[PDB]
Every structure is written in structure tokens, then in C-alpha cells.
Design an enzyme around this catalytic site. Sequence first.
Site, PDB file in Angstrom:
ATOM      1  CG  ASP A 332      33.659  81.341 134.592  1.00 19.57           C
ATOM      2  OD1 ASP A 332      34.240  81.057 135.661  1.00 19.57           O
ATOM      3  OD2 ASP A 332      32.843  80.576 134.036  1.00 19.57           O
ATOM      4  CE1 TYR A 463      32.648  76.769 139.310  1.00 18.44           C
ATOM      5  CE2 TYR A 463      35.005  76.612 138.867  1.00 18.44           C
ATOM      6  CZ  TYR A 463      33.711  76.844 138.426  1.00 18.44           C
ATOM      7  OH  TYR A 463      33.468  77.147 137.100  1.00 18.44           O
ATOM      8  CG  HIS A 521      31.597  79.596 129.501  1.00 16.20           C
ATOM      9  ND1 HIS A 521      30.930  80.328 130.461  1.00 16.20           N
ATOM     10  CD2 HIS A 521      32.850  79.402 129.976  1.00 16.20           C
ATOM     11  CE1 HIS A 521      31.746  80.565 131.471  1.00 16.20           C
ATOM     12  NE2 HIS A 521      32.917  80.016 131.201  1.00 16.20           N
TER      13      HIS A 521
END
Lengths: 545, 545
Positions: A332, A463, A521
Amino acid sequence: RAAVFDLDGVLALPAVFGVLGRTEEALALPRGLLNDAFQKGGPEGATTRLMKGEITLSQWIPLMEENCRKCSETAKVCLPKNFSIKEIFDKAISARKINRPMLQAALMLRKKGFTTAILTNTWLDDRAERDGLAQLMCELKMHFDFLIESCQVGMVKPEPQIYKFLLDTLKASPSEVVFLDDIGANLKPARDLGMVTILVQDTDTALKELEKVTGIQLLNTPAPLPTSCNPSDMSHGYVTVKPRVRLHFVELGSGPAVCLCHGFPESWYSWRYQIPALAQAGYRVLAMDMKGYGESSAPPEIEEYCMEVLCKEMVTFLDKLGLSQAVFIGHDWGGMLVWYMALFYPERVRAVASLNTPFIPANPNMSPLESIKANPVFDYQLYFQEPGVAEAELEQNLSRTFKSLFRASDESVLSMHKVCEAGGLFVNSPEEPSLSRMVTEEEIQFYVQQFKKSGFRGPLNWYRNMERNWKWACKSLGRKILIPALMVTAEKDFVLVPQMSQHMEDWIPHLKRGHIEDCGHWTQMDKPTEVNQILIKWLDSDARN
Amino acid sequence: RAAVFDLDGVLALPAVFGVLGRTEEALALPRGLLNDAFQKGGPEGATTRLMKGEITLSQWIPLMEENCRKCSETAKVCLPKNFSIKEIFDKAISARKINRPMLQAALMLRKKGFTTAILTNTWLDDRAERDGLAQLMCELKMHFDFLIESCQVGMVKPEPQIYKFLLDTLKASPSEVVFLDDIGANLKPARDLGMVTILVQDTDTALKELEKVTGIQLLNTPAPLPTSCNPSDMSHGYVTVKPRVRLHFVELGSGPAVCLCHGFPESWYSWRYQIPALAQAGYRVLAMDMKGYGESSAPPEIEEYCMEVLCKEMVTFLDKLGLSQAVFIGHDWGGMLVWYMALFYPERVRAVASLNTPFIPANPNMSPLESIKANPVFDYQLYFQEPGVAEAELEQNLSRTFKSLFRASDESVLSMHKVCEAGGLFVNSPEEPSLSRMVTEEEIQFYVQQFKKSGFRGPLNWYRNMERNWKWACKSLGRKILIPALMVTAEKDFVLVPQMSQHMEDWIPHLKRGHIEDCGHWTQMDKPTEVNQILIKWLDSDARN
């Protein structure tokens, strides 16, 4: 109830002791001629002293040769010119390996409320190749509550004392303990003491009996999850990479440095299934707590989390640790971080591997923010932009946040899209989330307690540097990743889809790949076994040389 | 005042760039033919892009070959059939090493209040052998406040921008900075900007000028102490080996695990001079904080400090760290501990080395307590027996205790004998102890602060298990240490005298030795240079294989 296993011939095969018979036949020597020079002397023999830790193995070697000479003298035969007892035992010991099924039966028994132990007549190994045995014993230790070695306690089977010691350390009485040994002689004492015994010849009959006596299925059983690690038993490391920025990591094994970098919102614990495996495979695993997580520092500022500073900090981490290089394996966001480590610090990266996260070079034209609106799946990211918001709901109920996130590709419980529009990420989500087949309540609580320290501000800032990360990345567009690299895609990752990786060879010519069926994921938790298999096959062929 | 050094041709020799000239001559190629295919294109050339980090080195290689072809086409000459630019630069880069004297001049300047930095036109190295350069750059980094690489900042000399950046990160104006470069072209910009420059051809003229301009002796200077380490820049590790027993250690470097075990009353810090050296020499150094010290647990109980439990705990330490083996290097009590590690856990010990402490096997007859009265020098030990006493005076004034203990063989200030009889250990000792040439006030304070946590109870308990350690040791009398071993004696250690080691070969046949002139009991601090030299020569020949 307790289970005791002998090493040689039970937990480990082929029985080293069994090389004496083989040697004899391979050399056309009188039957048992070598097994006699081995016991030559009884309790007062060189071997009993050796098994009692009185003398070392290298000291025993010569004493055994003579016993082979004298025993051959009585049998009226002569040994081969260059007969080497050390050469025979070296090849025998290294030739011996863990009896997987038997170890699995042990693991199982322990898992079902059984105290397990290994009672073995062994020796102090000082051969130049003692390491090989140290490793095997080291892999077995961790699986049993006790490891009683004869040369360590000063006792040896079949002496009644060693069995009294066993029951004493076991905190149990016979008729409550099962004793497995490939040598009847050593079974007798335990049997006569009242404990259940199993003469081990073939592993399956041995397990059938065991299964039959404990009333637990040990045979034909599924296939355990690879070994996971208990936070409290890990070596914890801390490195200050900057004034008030200290990184925490878990370290295990020896060999090339393999740095594990987790994604959002995880921790070093997300590698709980590969840290043991990778170490056992011959690597020095450094599972990171990425900046903003766990025991690592979590400064509040947003730009402290742009790839540039994060990467610059990993570099410093290697520096402070005296490491000039490390293979970086990320997942990730950690995977994104790893690709840039290879693009900006090749010298430091021995190899780069990423799970789910592909390497898509930045578009010099379209800004990031736009390229993220052009895909409803990345909507949740626009929602993490606004400082405060996401922190709010994600920190509101940690167990809920994690039980909601860590789920398999099927058992989803969030409308991954229409997030911002829906107000939150858990809008039509259960307050009482079901429990994923990937995580136990205990494991979830680990993340809960870990995230109770700094919360989601730092994690979320990762982010919040799209624009900044973009400008930086654009500096590398003319480059190519020419170091060993591995891309591992997960079929059922519905956000970091396998298709996004398809052009990676354009910038990573020699890129090697890996794929995992029905894997969501959270690749590590979801398919720990296949992941370990892929990373190890890769590490052993591309990062070791 | 600040000092800036270029890497190639100044801090590192031979100048990689200088291989082009050599190649030309070795191949009878037109003068400068290769230096022209190198600059072929000017600022818009492949090399400027490479120096700006635009492309990697492996990408540059091909672009340089063609430039060699085209440049040879114009000169009307042809290159050797198998001319390899990668083969030339590989051999050139690995052939380049630190310019010791120049680095020493840097170290010196920094030591005398100078901000130092390395301004270099370099490249992103992705060759399969990039590690070699990563290591050199890693060894140099630590010595300069700044390392400005061109391919990292996007600028390159002689562009005026890189020099404005230099002065900006340096927080200084010209006429306050000295700029050393082997290439005049790149000197000019800095000169014209007003800063002092030094064209470097030969190191000595270069240093004479430098010495001459800074007014500091950089040449013909003594010989620095080996690099020491600043506690705050070390990687700190913690391993719980038992419920409430956690061991702390400092970790540095990669390679075989070398475990450093200090004596009484010290800390991992006592290895401050070999941790950097041993790591640089290719080892993964784990400097321990032995049980009872520093950040390690210090349970009060006496038997928690017998060699048996201490050794059993080191074994567990290796276990928790996924290490099956480690070479153990000990000093004083740590040295005693190491010998027993080899006697009781050969499999785990890759090699054993001890400073000052010899291996004298226990006497099955005479008890320890007696064998300690038969030598006035070990009187102080009888004084440590009584719980409370020694703790009392040693903890009364920590700075005094340490300034009093850490002294050279000559500068003593304690009547090492007639201790118990004299009441204390500092009876006729100055309350205001002089400062030993081995330690700074700062270093002493490190021990003070370190000992303020648990005090001397744990450290002293090491001395309170003679009877117990004895019984245990007697279990090993029939053994021999047959693994690689090193005994290092210190001429002027008046308690752990060199003579006590003379019979070690009887039990350690292949024992290797080391001796150090005018060296007191604190070997590490006293003779850091010679110690490093002895351990490294030994490690590289006996613990690496």
C-alpha cells in the site's frame, strides 16, 4: 495433559543415530559394528559422557574412532583407509531435518491446551559446522514450552533421573503425559513410570496412535497458518532519524537486511506472518512502524509525510543502523514509498518489492488531485484531505474502524465509493462489525492499542501530499528502476487492481512479478502462506546474489 | 567559518574521473578522447543529465559508449573490440577509496568549530555493485555536517545555482567558507562568489594551503582517536528475555553478529570506540547493556546474576533476535561470561574473545572464596560480598566513583588492596578526583546518568555468586573450548594480569592471542586503536570464514 517428543527420529529425520547402520551397510561392515563402537562402554562410555555434556562433540570424535577400531578388531574386520567419523556425522547431522508432520502434531497439541516439550539426548556441538544444528534447534525451540537437552541438565536417557526431571519441569504426573521416542530402551523408563508412551518408527502410525490417545485430530489436518509473532517476544528497536522523529521497528533473523514497510492504517504487526518466515529463510527482517504509526513518532504537520521526507528518513534510518543497503518490501503506502526509494536511492536499495501498489510514473501534465477524481474507487482519498474529518470518525471507535477495514475480498461492509457524498466512511456500516476470518479479536485489539497512542492524524497525512509528492516524482520521470524489483498483484484488490501494474515493465525492464488468487487488499493477513512463498522465492534469487 | 570538500579527487582518490585519462594511455588512444566523449554535449550532455539525477548511471552507460564511438569517429581511430565503459567505471569506482589525510583534515576542522560539507557532482548509482559506493559515501557522511550531492538537488557544478544552494544550506556567506576541488572549472564559480578556494592536485600542498588559510594545524598532526559514538545517534534495541528481564543493546552495521559484553561497572558505552570500527569492518555489532546495567533490567536478587542465568539469558537473547550464533567479545566480567558461553553454548558462539579476563578452569577442590583470599589484589571483591556496603559508597557520588575508577595504569588514585580493612574503596581517595586522559567530563557524566537508574546493586551481584558460579563451572571441567577463541592481555592490568592467562592453551588448544603495551584494566578506553586493530584482524580471520 502434556506431550514430550524426542528430537532424533521423532521431530527430526533421518535419525542421525541411524547413520551408523547405513554406514555399516554402505561399507559392507559387520551388522551393528558401528552401533557397538557407539555404545562401547555403557553408562561409563565416551558417548554417555558426551550425552551428559561432560565432553564436547569434537572431543568425542576421537574417542569414537578408537571404539570403531577396537570394535572392528574384535569382529576381525578392518575399516576403510580414510574412514572419518567426523565426515560421517557431519553429513548425517546436516542431512537431518525437521519432521514436518510431527512438528505440526506438536503445534496442534499445544494449540489445544497441551504443554509440549522436547526431551532429547544431545551433545554440546563445537564442530566448525555447529551452526547448522543451532538453526534447526532454534526453529524447533519456539514451538515447544520446553526443550530439555541431556548434555545441558547432566542427565541422559534411559537413566530414571532425567524422567523425574521431565515430570518436574512439566508440572505434571504420569498418566497425564505422552512420551514419543524412536528408541524403546528410552521408552521403558517413562512407561514404567506410568506415562503413556509411543514407540515411533513411522510418523503416521505414530500420529495415528497419538491422535488416538489424545482424542485430537493431528493427521490429515488442514494446513496451519504460517508462524505469527507475539509482540512481547520481539526485539524492539528505536532509531532517532531527526530531533523529534524516532522510528520503531521489529527485528528478527540474520542475513541481508529486508525492510518491511506497511501501508495505511497498519503497523509492523501487519507483517506478523512473514517476519518469522523471512527470518527463517535467512534474512534479517526489520519490520517498520512507519512514521505516524505505533511506537514511531507522529509529528502533526502534513509535509512531514511527503515521500521526499519519508524516504529521506528511511535513508537516515539505514545510516543510523550502519546499513548501506536493504531490500525494501512495501505494501500500500509502504509500497509507494519503496518504489521511490529505488528511484531516488538505488545505492541504498538492494532490492524493491511491493504488494498491491504498482509503480505509475507521475504525469508531468495532469495534477494528482484530478487523476484521483477520475476513479470513484479513490474517492475515499478526497475524503481524507480535509484535516480533522477522517481523524474524527476513524478514532471514534478503533475496534470498529479496524474490524471494518481488515476484511477479505468478499466479507466487505463498506460502500467503498460515494464516501465524501455519504458524509463518512462507515455511514451504512454496522456499529457491531462482524469478525473477519483474517483476524482474531486479539489481533484487532493490538491495532486498537497501537493506534491509541497517536491516532490517525499522521497516518492520514500520508494522503495529504499528493501535490507535493507529485512535484518530487516528476523529477524522476527520465529514470528507470534497474535494480532487482518485484511486483505482487492481488486479484481481489478492488482499489489497487492488478491492471494498474501492466505497464510497469516500461520503467522497470527486469521487473519480476507475483500474483495471488482470491486475495484482498490486506495481502499479508489474507494470504500469508502464498505471500511468504513469493517473497522468499524472489529474495533468494534476486536479493542475495 | 566553513569547509567544503569535493568527493572525487579530494576526499576520495584516485579520482574516478581520472580513469578516463589512464584508459586512453593504456589503450594508446588519442589524448583526452575519452574525456571528450564524457563532456560530449556540454550542459545538454548525457553526463550533465546524469549528474543532475535526471537519468541513472546504468542509463548513462550506453549514452557514454556512443559518445565514445562518435568521438573516436571524429579523431579517426577505433576502440578495442571489447571496450566496456561499465567495466572501466566499475574498476574505477571500486578502485577509489577515502583520502585518509584529507578526511582527517576535515574531521579536525569540524572538531575546531567549523561547519563541514561535501559538495559533489555525483550520480544515482544502480549498478549491481552500487553497494561499494554506498558504503564509502556512508563512511564519509557521518563526518560532515552536510553532504550535497548534485544528482540529488538537481543542480551541478559549475552552474552558479549549486553554489548559491551551498551557501544557503551552510548558513554562511563567502569570505567565510573554504572550497576545495580538484577541478578549477568548478572552483571559479565559488572563487568569483568571494569564497576562499583551493585547487587540489596533491593532498599535502592542498592541506598546507588549507592549514595556512584556516590557521589550524591539519598536517603532521598526531593521529586521532578512532571514531566514537554519540548515544543519541545509536539504534537502541530492547529484548525481553524473561517476564521482567529486558536487555538493552546498541546495534550497528551488518554482517556476522558480534556481541559486545562489558564488565564492571560499565555499559555498552565502554565499547564506544570499537562499535564504529567493528561495524565499518563488516560486522553487525550488538553492544550489550549487561543485566543490572543501563537500560537493561536490574532485578535485586543475587542469584539472578550467576553465570548460569546470565548465560541462559544471552542464549534467549539470540533466540528472541533470530540469531543462531554470535561471536562473543567480553571484557572483565563480560569476558568471564563469554568464556562460559563457549563452554556451555558452543553452537551459539561463532567465536569467543575476551579482554584482560583469562579462562582459568574451576578447581574441583578449593572453594572460590578461598582462592580469592590468596591474592591481595582481589581483596576488593571480598568487600563487594556484603549486600549494601559497596552499593553505599559507590552510589554516594557517581561522578567521583567513575572519575576514580576510569584511569590509566599510571594515574591511579586508589589503594587497590587493604580495602575491606580500610573500610571503603575510596578511603584515602580525593573527593575531587582528577580527570583521566581516557575520559572527558561528558563521557563520565554518561556513566553517571546511566547508573542513576538502577545503581550498583545489580552490577555488584555479579560478584556475589562465586560459590554458585563455581558449582556450575565444575560441570565443564572435562571440556575444552574448540571454537575460534582470542585472549587479549593488557600489560598494565594489575589485577587481571597477563600471567593468569599463560595456561589457557591447555583448555583452548587453538587459542589465539593479543597483547597491548601500557594498557590498564579499561582496555577499550585506554587503547581503542590497538584494540580495534586486534579484534578486527582476529574477526576477519577466525569469525567470518
